[PDB]
């Protein structure tokens, strides 16, 4: 995917995450109502600190999921389908109230690169 496209796509998700680094240092200043994105690829779904989940996302991470470029790209895309689909649970609830049109990947790639 494309990371210089990606974050300019960044665009729909600043309204309620931001990317902050360990020391601090602001990439992404957004909001706060999302969990904060620096990292999320290669970290089990559901498990950043001081953040109150859906319970579905929280389930998806204690079944021992991790997200990965290319789960993000389409959880983006639908994030309830994709819970339902993953947990296997038709009742699957998103906190997340976004679904992105096209540009997952490129976000996704984005949010890889980030912490290089
Ligand atoms: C607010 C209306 C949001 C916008 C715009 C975006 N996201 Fe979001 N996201 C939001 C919430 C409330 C949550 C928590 C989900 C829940 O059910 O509790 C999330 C979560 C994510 C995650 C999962 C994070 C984790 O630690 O597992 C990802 C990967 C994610 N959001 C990506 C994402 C992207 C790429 C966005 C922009 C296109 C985006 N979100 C926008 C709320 C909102």
Do not use: Q
């Amino acid at each position: 995917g494309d990371a210089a496209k990606g974050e300019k796509e960044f665009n729909k998700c600043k309204t309620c995450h931001s990317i902050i680094a360990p020391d601090g240092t602001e990439i992404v200043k957004g909001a706060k109502t999302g969990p904060n994105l620096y990292g999320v690829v290669g970290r089990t779904a559901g498990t950043y600190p001081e953040f109150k989940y859906k319970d579905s996302i929280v389930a998806l991470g204690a079944s021992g999921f991790a997200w990965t470029e290319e789960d993000i790209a389409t959880y983006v895309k639908d994030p309830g389908a994709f819970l339902k689909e993953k947990l296997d649970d038709k009742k699957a609830k998103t906190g997340m109230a976004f679904k992105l049109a096209k540009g997952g990947e490129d976000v996704a790639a984005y949010l890889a690169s980030v912490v290089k």
